[PDB]
Amino acid sequence: SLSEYAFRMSRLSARLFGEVTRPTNSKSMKVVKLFSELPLAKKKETYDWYP
Amino acid sequence: QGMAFSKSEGKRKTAKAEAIVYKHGSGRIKVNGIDYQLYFPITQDREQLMFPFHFVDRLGKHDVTCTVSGGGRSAQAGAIRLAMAKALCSFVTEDEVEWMRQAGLLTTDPRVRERKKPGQEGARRKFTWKKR
Amino acid sequence: HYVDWRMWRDVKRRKMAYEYADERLRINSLRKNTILPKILQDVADEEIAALPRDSCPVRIRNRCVMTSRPRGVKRRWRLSRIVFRHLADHGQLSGIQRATW
Amino acid sequence: TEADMEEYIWENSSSERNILETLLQMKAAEKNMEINKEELLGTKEIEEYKKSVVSLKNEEENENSISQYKESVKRLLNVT
Amino acid sequence: SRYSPEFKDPLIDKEYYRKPVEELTEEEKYVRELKKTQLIKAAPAGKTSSVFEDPVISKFTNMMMIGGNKVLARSLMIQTLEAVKRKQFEKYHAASAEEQATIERNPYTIFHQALKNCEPMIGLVPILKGGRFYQVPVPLPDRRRRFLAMKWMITECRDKKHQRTLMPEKLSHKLLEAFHNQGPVIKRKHDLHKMAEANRALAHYRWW
Amino acid sequence: AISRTNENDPAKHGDQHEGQHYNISPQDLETVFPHGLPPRFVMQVKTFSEACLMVRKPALELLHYLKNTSFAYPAIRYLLYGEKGTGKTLSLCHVIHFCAKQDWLILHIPDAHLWVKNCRDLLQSSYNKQRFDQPLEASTWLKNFKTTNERFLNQIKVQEKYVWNKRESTEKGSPLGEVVEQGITRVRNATDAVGIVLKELKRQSSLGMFHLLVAVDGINALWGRTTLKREDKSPIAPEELALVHNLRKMMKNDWHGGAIVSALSQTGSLFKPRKAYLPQELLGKEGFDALDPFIPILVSNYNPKEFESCIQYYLENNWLQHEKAPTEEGKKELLFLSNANPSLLERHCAYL
Numbered sequence: 001s002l003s004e005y006a007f008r009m010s011r012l013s014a015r016l017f018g019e020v021t022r023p024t025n026s027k028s029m030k031v032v033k034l035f036s037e038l039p040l041a042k043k044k045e046t047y048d049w050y051p
Numbered sequence: 052q053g054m055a056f057s058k059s060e061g062k063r064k065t066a067k068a069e070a071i072v073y074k075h076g077s078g079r080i081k082v083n084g085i086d087y088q089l090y091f092p093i094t095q096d097r098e099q100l101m102f103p104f105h106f107v108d109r110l111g112k113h114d115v116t117c118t119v120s121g122g123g124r125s126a127q128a129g130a131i132r133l134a135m136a137k138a139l140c141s142f143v144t145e146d147e148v149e150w151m152r153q154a155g156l157l158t159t160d161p162r163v164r165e166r167k168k169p170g171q172e173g174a175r176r177k178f179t180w181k182k183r
Numbered sequence: 184h185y186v187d188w189r190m191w192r193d194v195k196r197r198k199m200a201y202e203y204a205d206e207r208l209r210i211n212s213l214r215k216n217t218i219l220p221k222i223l224q225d226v227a228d229e230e231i232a233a234l235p236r237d238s239c240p241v242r243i244r245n246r247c248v249m250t251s252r253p254r255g256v257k258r259r260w261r262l263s264r265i266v267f268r269h270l271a272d273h274g275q276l277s278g279i280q281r282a283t284w
Numbered sequence: 285t286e287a288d289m290e291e292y293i294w295e296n297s298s299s300e301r302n303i304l305e306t307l308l309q310m311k312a313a314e315k316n317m318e319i320n321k322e323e324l325l326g327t328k329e330i331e332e333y334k335k336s337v338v339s340l341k342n343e344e345e346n347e348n349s350i351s352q353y354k355e356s357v358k359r360l361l362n363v364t
Numbered sequence: 365s366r367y368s369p370e371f372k373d374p375l376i377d378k379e380y381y382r383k384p385v386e387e388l389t390e391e392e393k394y395v396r397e398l399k400k401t402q403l404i405k406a407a408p409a410g411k412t413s414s415v416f417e418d419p420v421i422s423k424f425t426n427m428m429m430i431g432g433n434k435v436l437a438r439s440l441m442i443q444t445l446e447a448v449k450r451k452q453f454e455k456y457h458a459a460s461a462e463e464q465a466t467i468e469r470n471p472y473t474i475f476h477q478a479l480k481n482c483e484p485m486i487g488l489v490p491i492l493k494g495g496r497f498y499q500v501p502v503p504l505p506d507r508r509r510r511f512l513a514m515k516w517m518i519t520e521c522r523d524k525k526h527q528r529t530l531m532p533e534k535l536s537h538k539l540l541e542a543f544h545n546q547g548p549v550i551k552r553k554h555d556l557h558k559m560a561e562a563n564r565a566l567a568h569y570r571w572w
Numbered sequence: 573a574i575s576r577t578n579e580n581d582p583a584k585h586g587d588q589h590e591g592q593h594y595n596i597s598p599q600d601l602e603t604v605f606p607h608g609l610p611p612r613f614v615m616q617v618k619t620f621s622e623a624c625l626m627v628r629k630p631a632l633e634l635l636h637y638l639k640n641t642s643f644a645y646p647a648i649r650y651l652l653y654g655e656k657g658t659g660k661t662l663s664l665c666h667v668i669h670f671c672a673k674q675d676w677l678i679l680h681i682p683d684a685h686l687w688v689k690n691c692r693d694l695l696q697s698s699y700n701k702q703r704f705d706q707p708l709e710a711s712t713w714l715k716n717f718k719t720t721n722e723r724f725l726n727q728i729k730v731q732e733k734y735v736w737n738k739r740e741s742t743e744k745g746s747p748l749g750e751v752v753e754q755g756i757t758r759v760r761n762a763t764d765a766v767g768i769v770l771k772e773l774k775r776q777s778s779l780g781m782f783h784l785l786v787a788v789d790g791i792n793a794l795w796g797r798t799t800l801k802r803e804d805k806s807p808i809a810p811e812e813l814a815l816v817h818n819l820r821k822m823m824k825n826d827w828h829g830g831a832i833v834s835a836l837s838q839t840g841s842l843f844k845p846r847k848a849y850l851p852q853e854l855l856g857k858e859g860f861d862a863l864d865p866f867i868p869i870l871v872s873n874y875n876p877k878e879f880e881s882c883i884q885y886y887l888e889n890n891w892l893q894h895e896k897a898p899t900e901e902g903k904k905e906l907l908f909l910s911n912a913n914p915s916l917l918e919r920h921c922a923y924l
C-alpha cells in the first residue's frame with residue numbers, strides 16, 4: 001500500500017538504521033528477536049535464582 | 052485590553068477546571084477553545100453551566116473561557132460549574148454571594164469513588180453468602 | 184543442603200538449561216522461519232528433540248528460595264507469601280509497609 | 285508522486301488544471317480568442333486564487349481561510 | 365456519607381432569597397441568620413434553579429433509569445412529552461370549535477393529572493396479631509401514594525405484552541389513557557381498592 | 573404576525589424579509605418537496621398544519637447568485653457549510669423552491685449518505701461488470717424525480733437508443749418519461765435509468781432546452797468511504813457504485829445552462845468526527861479537488877433577530893405550552909441551552 005518512492009525510501013532508511021532490508025514475513029522475524037536478546041535460561045535471574 | 056475579569060478553579064471527582072469570567076460579555080462560554088454547546092452535547096451538562104448565572108439573574112452578561120481535564124462528561128460540567136460560580140462571586144453583591152453559598156453553588160462536592168476492598172465484590176457489594 | 188529434593192531437582196534443571204541454552208537457541212532459529220527448506224527444518228526438529236529433557240526451560244519452576252514452596256511466590260523477592268510476610272511484618276524489608284487507603 | 289509530497293504545490297495540480305479549463309470555457313462563451321495560458325495564469329486574480337488554495341492545503345483550515353478562498357473564486361468566475 | 369452531620373441540604377429557590385426583609389417574621393429572620401453559620405452541601409447535578417424544572421418528572425425519569433444511563437432515560441422522557449403533545453395537537457385540529465375547548469395540549473398538565481388518577485387511597489399492610497400476619501387496610505402516606513402511581517405506570521410499560529413498541533409510544537399512550545381514567549394502570553388501582561374493601565373486617569387491627 | 577411575511581414568492585424575498593417566515597403552499601410541498609425536507613421539519617408541518625420557512629441571509633445570498641446566473645458560462649458550484657443543525661438543508665430547500673417556481677428542471681438528491689450505507693440488495697451491474705447497482709435506492713429516487721419534474725418529462729426526449737434487454741429498448745426521440753418509467757417498473761433497470769437521466773439532462777441543458785438545478789444534500793458522501801461490503805466481506809469504494817459514479821459527473825463544471833448547489837452534512841456521514849464541518853474536513857482531499865473552484869456559503873446560528881422571530885412563530889402556533897416559556901426569563905434559558913442553534917432550539921421546544 002506504498003508508492004514506489006515511499007517503498008524505496010523505506011528500504012533506504014532500513015539500511016542506514018541497520019534494520020532488516022529484505023522482505024521478511026512475521027514468522028521469519030522471530031529469528032531476529034531470538035538473537036537480539038539473551039535466552040531466558042541465560043538471564044542471571046534464571047540460573048542464579050537460588051542462593 | 053483593559054477588560055476586567057476574575058479567575059477561579061473547581062474540582063469534581065477526578066475533573067479539574069479553571070474558569071476566567073469577564074465582567075462584561077454577551078454570554079459566550081468557551082470550553083478548551085470550543086463553544087459550550089459543541090463541547091457539552093448532553094443537555095444536562097449545559098443546564099449545569101446555566102445554574103450559576105441564572106441563579107443570580109446574569110444570563111447573557113458575561114463571557115467565560117474555561118479549561119477542564121480529567122473525569123467524565125458530567126464531572127467536567129460539575130467542575131466548570133464550581134469554577135464559574137467562584138469567579139462570578141467577584142461581580143455580585145455580598146448578599147448575592149451568601150445566597151449562592153446557601154444554594155450549594157460554592158461547595159466542593161466531596162463524593163469521590165470508594166476503593167474496592169479485598170474479600171468482597173465491590174466497595175460495599177459483598178460476595179454471595181453461599182447457600183447453606 | 185538445599186531445602187528438599189524438589190528444590191535440588193530444580194537446581195539441576197537450571198544448571199542444565201544454562202549449559203544447553205546456546206545450542207537450543209541456534210537449533211530453534213533454524214525451525215522458526217519460512218526461509219530454510221523443510222528438509223533442513225525437519226532435521227532440526229529431531230535434533231532439538233534429542234537433547235536432554237532437563238535442558239528445556241519450560242520445566243524450570245520458580246520456587247521459594249527459603250522454603251521451596253512452588254506456588255504463592257513473589258518474583259521480585261523470590262519468597263513465598265508466608266516467608267515474605269514474616270520478614271515484612273518484622274520491619275526487615277526496606278521500605279515495605281502495610282497498605283491502608 | 286503528489287501523494288509523497290508533504291507540502292502542497294499549486295503548479296501542475298488539479299487546482300491549476302481545473303481553474304484553467306474553466307477560464308477557457310468562459311472565454312469561449314464570450315467568443316474571445318485570447319486563449320494564451322501565460323496570459324490567463326498571469327493576472328492578479330489567479331495569484332490571489334493560488335495564494336488561497338495553498339493556504340487551505342498547507343495551513344490549518346479555518347473560517348478566515350475559507351472566506352479568503354471564497355472572494356478569490358468569485359472574482360475569477362465573475363460572481364458579484 | 366462523605367458529608368459530616370453538620371452539612372445542611374442546599375435550598376435552590378430564587379424566590380426564597382429575593383423575598384424582602386419586611387415580609388419576614390421573627391422566626392424566618394432567625395433561620396436566615398442561622399444558615400449564615402452552617403455548612404451547605406454542594407448542589408447535586410440533578411436539580412437547578414431553572415424555570416422549566418419539574419421535580420415529579422425528574423423523579424419519574426430516575427425510576428426509568430437502567431444501570432445509571434440517565435441520558436437514555438432523559439431521552440425517553442422528552443420523547444414521551446413530545447409524543448403526548450403531538451397527539452393532542454392532532455386531536456385538537458381534528459375537533460370542532462366546541463370540543464376544542466376541552467382538549468388539553470400541555471403535556472405537563474396531562475402527566476401530573478394522569479399520575480394523580482392512578483394514586484391509590486388505601487393499601488394493605490401486614491399487621492401481626494396473635495402470632496399471625498393479616499393484610500389490614502390502612503391509609504397510605506402521600507409519599508407512598510405517589511411512588512406506587514409511578515411504579516405501576518413504569519411496570520406496565522415494561523410488560524412484555526407490548527410487542528416491538530418503543531417506550532415513548534407506549535408511555536404516551538398509557539398517560540393519555542390514565543388522563544381519562546382508563547387503561548390497565550387505573551385497573552390496578554381499582555384492584556387494590558377492591559382487595560382492601562374485601563378485608564374491611566380486619567381494619568380494626570390498626571392502632572394508629 | 574410579527575414573525576410572518578405575506579410575500580410567498582421566493583423570487584421577491586430580500587434583506588427586508590430576513591427573520592420572517594414565508595408560507596409554502598400545500599401544492600408545492602407535494603410537487604416540489606416529495607423528499608429533502610428534514611425529518612423533524614416534516615413532523616412540524618404535520619403538527620402545525622402548515623409549512624413556513626424563515627428567510628435568512630444564507631439563502632438570500634444564494635438566491636442573489638442564482639438570479640444573476642450567466643447560463644452561457646459553465647455551471648457554478650455553490651457549497652453550503654456550517655455547524656450541525658444550523659439550517660444547511662432548509663437553506664438549500666428555499667433555493668430549490670425558487671428554481672422550481674422559475675420553471676427550472678430540479679435534480680434533487682435529498683441525502684447522498686443513503687447511497688453508501690445500509691444496502692441490502694447490492695447487485696452487480698450488467699452494463700459494466702465492474703460496478704454495482706442499487707435498485708432500491710435508485711427506484712426510490714426515480715419516483716420522487718418523476719413527481720417534481722412531471723410536467724417536463726414529456727417535452728424532453730432522448731437523443732440516443734438505450735438497450736435494456738434483448739427485447740426491450742428505448743428508441744431515439746422517445747420522451748424521457750419512458751426512461752423513468754422503465755426504471756420504476758423494472759427495478760433491475762433503475763440504476764441504469766438514473767444514469768441515463770443524468771446523461772440526458774446534462775446534455776440537453778447545454779443545448780438550451782431548459783435550465784437545470786443540481787441539488788445534492790450531503791455531497792461529502794461521493795468522495796468518502798462506504799460501509800458496503802462484497803460477498804468476500806471486502807470494502808467497496810464509492811467509484812464502484814453506479815449511482816455515485818454517475819452523480820460525480822453532474823458535479824463537474826463541464827456543462828452550462830444551470831447551477832450546482834450542494835450542502836455538506838456530518839449527520840449520517842461515515843468515518844467523520846462529530847464536530848467536523850469545514851469543507852476540506854468533510855470533503856477530504858479527493859472531494860475538495862472534484863469541486864474546486866467552488867463558492868462556499870456559511871450557515872450559522874440564529875442571530876438575535878432570527879431567534880426572537882423563531883420563538884414568536886412557535887408561540888403563534890401555541891407550540892410552547894409551558895406557562896413560563898413566553899416570559900422573558902423563559903426565553904433566556906431557551907437561548908442559553910441552545911446557544912441560538914436552530915436544531916437544538918427546535919428539539920427543546922418540542923417537549924416544552
Ligand SMILES: Nc1nc2c(ncn2[C@@H]2O[C@H](COP(=O)(O)OP(=O)(O)NP(=O)(O)O)[C@@H](O)[C@H]2O)c(=O)[nH]1
Nearest residue numbers: 699700733734735736763764765767768771814818
Ligand atoms: N442499460 C443501459 N444503461 C445505459 C445505456 N447507456 C447509458 N447507460 C447508463 O448511463 C450511464 C452513463 O452513460 P455513459 O456516459 O454512456 O456511460 P459510460 O460509458 O459508463 N461512461 P464512462 O466512461 O464515463 O464510465 C452508464 O453508466 C449506464 O449506467 C444503455 O444503452 N443501456
Ligand SMILES: Nc1ncnc2c1ncn2[C@@H]1O[C@H](COP(=O)(O)OP(=O)(O)OP(=O)(O)O)[C@@H](O)[C@H]1O
Nearest residue numbers: 610626656657658659660661662837839914915918
Ligand atoms: N430556515 C429555517 N426555517 C425554519 N426552521 C429552520 C430553518 N433553518 C433551520 N430551522 C430549524 O432547524 C432545524 C435543522 O435544520 P436543517 O436540518 O436544515 O439543518 P442542517 O444544518 O442542514 O442540519 P444537519 O447538520 O443535521 O445536516 C430544522 O428542522 C428547523 O427546526
Ligand SMILES: [Mg+2]
Nearest residue numbers: 172173174176
Ligand atoms: Mg457493582
Ligand SMILES: [Mg+2]
Nearest residue numbers: 241242243244
Ligand atoms: Mg511453569
Ligand SMILES: [Mg+2]
Nearest residue numbers: 660661662837
Ligand atoms: Mg442537513
